[PDB]
Structure formats: C-alpha cells, structure tokens
C-alpha cells in the first residue's frame, strides 16, 4: 500500500539568546522514528521507535552529521531571508522545511515533495515535476534563482526518487511488525441525556493505526439532528490514535442513528448503535 518517509525540520531564531533552535523529526507513515534537537552540547540523531535500534553506530553518526550541517545551513538561511525582508535582529523568525517520499501500492516512487516556509507561510516549493519551483514572492524568487543556478532540483530529484525511496524500503522492513501491522479501532457508543427531550450519542474509536479513519453518524432519513461535533484525530501516546463523533438527538430517536467506522485494519466497515 501507500507509504511515506517524511522529515520535518524547524529552525527558530533566538534574538539575543545565541544561535537558532533547530528540531528535526522523521516519520515513516504515521510513526515517528528519529529526532534531532540541536539544544545540546553534542546533539545526536536518536531513534524514536524501538525498531530503529537495529541500525549500527555509523548510521547514527551519519545522520548526526547530516542534521548538524542542516542546523548550520538553516542559521544561514534565517540570516539570508531576514536580509531579503529588511527585518531587524530583534525579531524571532521561523524557517520550516518538510521533505520526503510517497510510495504507491505498486511499491515504486509515486510523489516527492520539498517545501520551505518562512514564518508560517509558503515560501519556496518544488513542483511535482521535480524540475521547476514556485516562489511565493520576490524574496523567494532569489532563492529559486539560486536553486536553478546550483541545479538544486536535479540533486533533489535524485534524493526523492532514489535515496529516500530506498531507505523507506529499509525502514518498512526493520519496523515490519509494527509499521505494516494495521490496528483496527475499538468502537463503542456512549449515551448522555442533555435534558428530558434530547440526548447526546458519542461514537468512540480507540487505539487504531494508521491515523486515517472515518467516523460517521449515519441516519435513516427521519432523524432530527440538533447538533453534531467531530474531533480531530489525536495521538493516544502509545503509537495509536483516538477519535470520536457526537450527535444531539431527540430522546426517543436514538435508534435512528448508526455509527459507521471505516479503517484499513477492519476487514469490513463497522456499524454500531447505542
């Protein structure tokens, strides 16, 4: 099925407090597996999933060097963009970088992406053709001009289509028993009478992986929904996720409402009622 290896890099400048803070996290699908935080004397790339301890000392040394070099490059990038926009030394600013692969069901490279953000807004983006760029403004056009001069898209195309795809295959094998094992949600409906006329029905989905899920309060046509609320999928803290959907129904119309749950770990979709 579809799989992705993603790196999310964040660099925030500290006015008057030293060098910028740099944090990098790596994901395989919805599983974080590595971290780098430069707020240390000797920061190292460290595993964030247990199956990554199967990698030797040189692997961690190489990623540690790659991450420390990136932190320095982002410190230069912060100074550069701050000069592009005529911004003072007193302002704290953020440069964000997401990078990675996506595989299709066929297992081969499907889509790559490399995007830059300055202060929470789009800045520089590599297009899906992996040969052109999109600059958000006049400043980012200078960065695009530098990227074309250095054949940056050519080097990114080789990383996104080859180096990144090969290591995603290596990570899916080491974390095989956890990455490729689908966890179906555990589902139940709760009932709380808001008043003598109406009642809340809440459909729960607990402990599922991956995060993609659909919770729907289906209805037989004759339900008179008074209110509804879906919550964002949230991490349970143990590698799995949670979600619930609620609906305010006239008391006496509970049976007209069914909860439909879709998830890759389910052999069939699940329907459940109070």
């Amino acid at each position: 099925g579809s799989h992705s290896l993603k790196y999310f890099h964040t660099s925030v400048s500290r006015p008057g407090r030293g060098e910028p803070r740099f944090i990098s996290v790596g994901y395989v699908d919805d599983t974080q597996f590595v971290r780098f935080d430069n707020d240390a004397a000797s920061p190292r790339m460290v595993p964030r999933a247990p199956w990554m301890e199967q990698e030797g000392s040189e692997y961690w040394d190489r990623e540690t060097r790659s991450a420390r070099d990136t932190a320095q490059i982002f410190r230069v990038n912060l100074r550069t963009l701050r000069g592009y926009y005529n911004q003072s030394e007193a302002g704290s600013h953020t440069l964000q970088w997401m990078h990675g692969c996506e595989l299709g069901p066929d297992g081969r490279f499907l889509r790559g992406y490399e995007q830059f953000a300055y202060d929470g807004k789009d800045y520089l983006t590599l297009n899906e053709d992996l040969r052109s760029w999109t600059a958000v403004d006049t400043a980012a056009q200078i960065s695009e001009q530098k990227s074309n001069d250095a054949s940056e898209a050519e080097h990114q195309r080789a990383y996104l289509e080859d180096t990144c795809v090969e290591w995603l295959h290596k990570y899916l094998e080491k974390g095989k028993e956890t990455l490729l094992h689908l966890e179906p949600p555990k589902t139940h409906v709760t009932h709380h009478p808001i008043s003598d006329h109406e009642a809340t029905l809440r459909c729960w989905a607990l402990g599922f992986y991956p995060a993609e899920i659909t919770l729907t309060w289906q209805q037989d046509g004759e339900g008179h929904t008074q209110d509804t609320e879906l919550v964002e999928t949230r991490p349970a803290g143990d590698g799995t996720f949670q979600k619930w959907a609620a609906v305010v129904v006239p008391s006496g119309e509970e049976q007209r409402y069914t909860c439909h749950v879709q998830h890759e770990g389910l052999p069939e979709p699940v329907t459940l009622r109070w």
Binding site: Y7, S24, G26, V34, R62, E63, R65, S66, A67, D69, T70, I73, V76, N77, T80, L81, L95, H99, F116, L124, S143, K146, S147, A150, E152, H155, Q156, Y159, T163, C164, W167
Partner: peptide, 9 residues
C-alpha cells in the same frame, strides 16, 4: 536517511 542540504536559500 535525511538529506544534507546542497544549496542555500
């Protein structure tokens, strides 16, 4: 495996 940057913004 992350990518050591090649160019500057």
């Amino acid at each position: 495996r992350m990518y050591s940057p090649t160019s500057i913004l």
